[PDB]
């Protein structure tokens, strides 16, 4: 009894300044969403000959780890809440902190050697997963953002009816799996994925490219500039509309 | 001792059927979005599954589909006849044919508007081009397989589907937890969707999405997937309404009012 | 509080109004037929999969039926036996066995009619219907002793499932504790009489009323399923299996 | 302490563990082209039924619990339970044989039994004892975790992983073998010539399947193993 | 609401604690983590032709048995969740104290792992699946032997981050269901991704060394390899190329949950 509800009241929201503590909960969320994406990449590595949809579904289930970590630990994920029924200066704080968390996990994943796993296939999986996010028209990217954050917010929202750990965790699997297998776009998730792809594209050894049968040229859209303009901006706009789409 | 909370069932029915303004219309739009989500999930999971055993691919897609009903029940959105013995029974005293009309018509038309908005939003997303067009093709095929039933067939598949949705919601009521309410619905929903039973609201998403793809897909899409608009000739607004929506909706009504016209053969004092 | 454990009180059962027992039994027939429909869906096209794996998945799906029975309080033939030791007569307890049994049959056959009207058998280029034909025909070749024993085996499982469900406090407890025992008996091909009242009639109806186009698509003929007849169903399956179920549900000892 | 509650609950447990094994055989029939570990793992999940049955229904399975029944005179009804378990297992062997199941999946079901049983017959005595320790450690751990359980969910599902581990890994449980090897012997000795043609083997190919070999090569060392395994 | 006080005190308690109840419990944890890795090897034997990620994912789910066993039974696993002892030997507990028992648990974990190695070896298990089980152990162990020091430290950080988060979430658990199942995903994630846990490695690499050194000629012919093909499997190489940098990594990884919170 009691120990459990102690740990999860300390997980929750909406004292505005002190930030810093908010900035640190948001770094935490960036690390959790980065975990989700690494899990996804691990599970879908080598699944090129499975049925498309089945691979993606399993990657999706695995990814829900990230959001579970955010809700049970009480980290602060950009616009993931909006069970704020009783703003934007605070959003900037969370966003920038999400970003730092994600970039810290990129650095750590890079230092681990993991791109070489499965004879380079893990790294190529990152290269292709990131590259596929790079070819949307602006309207597409905004719409895929709308869809992703819709699902994240509904997941979080259901979580509240939760009484047990089981309830709060597992009610989030299906909607999270749904957006991730469907390839909807979440901006914070992308702050890990596309950077991770950029780092791999720029610092992979000649050996890696031989092993995987590609070259850094095959991935010409993975650049910080292109990332910001072609993905991050229109996706982020899309996530805002997405999380807002419900309220109205 | 006899607990005859048909009363509570009816009383619930009277509020839902006549009360709050467009709260209902707005909740029904929300349910249309949720059932759209469910079918999008089914398409994603089953994209590229052509070579898997038929049943397995369908069984998986059906589990995924259950998200939609989970969404509806847990968030309190309004899904046409689904389940609501509430409203149907609950006319058995307290409600006039005219009010039922107003309401079923209100929820239906809202369910549709949600569905059509998600159609428009999926189409703007570019999703049809996913997996080298195989996502799109999957929608075309799924929609087309809903287009060749006789009238009797389509009514029956509709009875079967809505029986399942209603048993799912009915079992939900015994739910004590979130875990309880959500997961008790997985098996009966998966059953209806894997066996290709027909639900009108789900089809308000699926068939229009098929029509939209057929009419607006680029030549690049058709070359990629090896097909043509002509290969799905039945996907038209007119065919949808007369060969699917009409008979399937009739079927759904027979199928969900059955559960009650039946709680009764087991109440009558 | 959370009263709607008024729903689970709304269930129960012993000493009776007769026609209200007949309706819950129809209900149970409908539920088990659903189970079997589910199974045939899941396993259609699974010819190439490893035998046991296809069977197991089919068995997990099947458990819907029993879940539907217990959580809804429908009346399934000799399924709550163990429970019913919680006034024993052999013309009174037997009087409603017959009532439930006959009720189960009506539900099953109403589901057979409805599935047939649905066109379902044409699903998967006729493989759904062929699945039904083959599933039923495999239950038609047992020697009398085999059938009784597959009957004991099957009902032993169903009774144990229902029994365990009693310890169940949540919907999760009650539904999920039955998935393993039910999956086991379905996937092992044990024989449940009521489930049979759906499957075999279903096969008969297909064998008899399928179009020529169906036989050509699936590459078989009504001659390849000569044991699918109402007379063979009753004598070679339903009788011995039912006997079997009875013994099965009653392994009480001293 | 009433000794015929005990002897009958033990029979009940032998029935449950035979059920467990049958389920496993069903699941794994035809799985020869599946990756080894995957088939075994699924087979192992299926098996957990038996122990779930034992715990929720309160049957009496030889030397688990025991981690709990320490919260030296024990051997008392160890003999009683053990002999009980055997009768349940052997009764199920008779019932399975009467059912015609060995002919399932064109004889593959039976051949699956012959092979699973034969694979238990080739251990050195030190091997059999050790797989015996490993098996019963897991059963006993499972049953111990079960007590923390508050719901039916808790008690049943906390046992799936540790049981699946022991079965998939091929550790040796004496009572489960009381079903599996007997079943194999019966099939070997009585299967019709149709069956041997169907599965393309012969009773010769399973020479070790005999009551005497069973006792000396598998039952005695695995039982010693389960007792040591149950206390650590 | 400072839980930092209760956890510190629970911290202080566990680090200071009844005699060799903690030694006993650490041996117990070494046995549990060995069980986890055995399960993983069983599940993934013969999975060479499955998609990489899928085999690893399934193996990872199976592995989670170990941590479940640890948490539900209360065994003592090195630095987690010593989220306690460490995080909140800011205050009480000396360097002399936090060492006295990290060292106690660590050495206990090792003894448990090594006892399980001996018992697995005596069981004959390496011959399972026509030697593929043993080959699976050889390969799994060998893949942990080719990291640069910085790589091994980082894989250590990653692994113990996940173990600590798993155990941390477990605290919110009210049921057996809650506590056990909330750990499946984070443990599966680390194991499938090949992150490095020191105690798990105290089973896996010794197991590999034992197989390499004592396998019969029949085993090598069956699996089509030789002891030479696994030249890095030695006690010396284990210690310097894996155990040291991974352990350093695990400490940073779990302690990083100190600095966190504040």
């Amino acid at each position: 009894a009691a120990m459990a509800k102690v740990a999860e009241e300390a997980g929750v929201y909406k004292a505005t300044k002190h930030p810093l503590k908010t900035f640190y909960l948001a770094i935490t969320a960036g690390v959790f969403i980065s975990i989700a994406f690494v899990f996804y990449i691990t599970a879908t590595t080598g699944t090129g000959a499975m049925p498309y949809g089945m691979a993606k579904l399993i990657g999706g289930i695995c990814f829900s780890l990230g959001l579970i970590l955010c809700v049970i630990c009480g980290a602060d994920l950009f616009t993931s809440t909006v069970l704020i029924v009783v703003l934007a200066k605070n959003w900037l704080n969370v966003y920038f902190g999400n970003l730092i968390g994600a970039l810290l996990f990129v650095l750590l994943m890079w230092l681990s050697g993991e791109y070489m796993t499965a004879n380079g296939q893990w790294g190529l999986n990152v290269l292709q997963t990131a590259d596929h996010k790079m070819h949307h028209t602006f309207i597409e990217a905004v719409c895929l953002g709308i869809l992703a954050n819709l699902m994240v917010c509904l997941a979080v929202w259901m979580s509240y009816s939760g009484r047990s750990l089981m309830d709060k965790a597992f009610i989030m699997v299906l909607p999270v799996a749904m957006f991730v297998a469907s390839g909807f776009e979440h901006s914070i998730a992308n702050m890990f994925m596309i950077p991770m792809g950029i780092v791999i594209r720029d610092f992979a050894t000649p050996e890696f490219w031989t092993a995987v049968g590609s070259s850094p040229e095959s991935f010409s859209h993975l650049t910080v500039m292109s990332f910001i303009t072609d993905n991050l901006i229109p996706v982020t706009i899309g996530n805002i509309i997405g999380g807002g789409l419900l309220v109205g």
Side-chain angles (χ1 to χ4, degrees), chain A:
Chain A
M3 131 90 320
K5 285 320 144 163
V6 192
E8 266 205 83
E9 288 297 294
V12 163
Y13 13 94
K14 236 327 171 69
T16 324
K17 299 207 272 77
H18 207 211
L20 236 296
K21 175 219 191 152
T22 283
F23 191 64
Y24 203 57
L25 284 182
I27 287 175
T28 282
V31 175
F32 293 159
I33 247 50
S34 289
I35 287 165
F37 244 143
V38 159
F39 198 178
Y40 167 100
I41 300 289
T42 278
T44 61
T45 288
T47 63
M50 273 188 78
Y52 189 88
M54 297 303 154
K56 250 62 201 226
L57 175 63
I58 288 144
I61 287 165
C62 284
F63 189 105
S64 74
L65 217 219
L67 212 252
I68 288 171
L69 250 10
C70 289
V71 165
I72 303 312
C73 293
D76 251 286
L77 185 72
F78 184 66
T79 73
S80 70
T81 44
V82 155
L83 326 119
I84 312 188
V85 178
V86 152
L87 163 151
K89 37 279 130 206
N90 181 246
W91 276 6
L92 207 109
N93 191 31
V94 175
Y95 196 89
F96 181 59
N98 290 170
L99 181 65
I100 273 159
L103 297 190
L104 291 171
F105 216 78
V106 173
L107 175 67
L108 181 57
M109 290 307 308
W110 178 254
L111 293 177
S112 75
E114 187 88 350
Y115 82 115
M116 282 297 318
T117 288
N119 191 213
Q121 294 295 313
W122 197 98
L124 173 71
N125 186 13
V126 178
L127 284 164
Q128 296 157 167
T129 299
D131 187 45
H132 280 73
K133 300 172 169 314
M134 291 306 285
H135 300 94
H136 305 317
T137 62
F138 193 94
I139 287 152
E140 290 169 342
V142 167
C143 291
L144 299 162
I146 294 188
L147 294 152
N149 217 22
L150 224 219
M151 295 318 291
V152 173
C153 300
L154 288 164
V156 180
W157 174 262
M158 291 184 300
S159 215
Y160 223 101
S161 311
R163 40 225 305 351
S164 54
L165 200 56
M166 206 83 225
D167 286 344
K168 305 203 177 108
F170 269 55
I171 198 69
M172 301 201 287
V173 174
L174 260 29
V176 174
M178 192 268 185
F179 103 71
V180 175
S182 313
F184 299 163
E185 299 269 3
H186 191 272
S187 54
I188 313 300
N190 295 1
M191 282 166 187
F192 175 88
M193 184 55 60
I194 301 169
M196 187 57 71
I198 291 153
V199 168
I200 296 165
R201 191 213 167 187
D202 294 356
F203 308 104
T205 63
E207 289 74 36
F208 164 88
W209 300 113
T210 314
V212 303
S214 187
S215 61
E217 269 87 13
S218 309
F219 296 101
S220 73
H221 293 243
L222 303 194
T223 65
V224 177
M225 213 42 214
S226 299
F227 168 47
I228 289 145
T229 50
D230 303 334
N231 188 278
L232 192 56
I233 290 162
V235 175
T236 311
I237 299 167
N239 307 152
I240 294 158
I241 302 167
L245 206 286
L246 275 159
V247 200

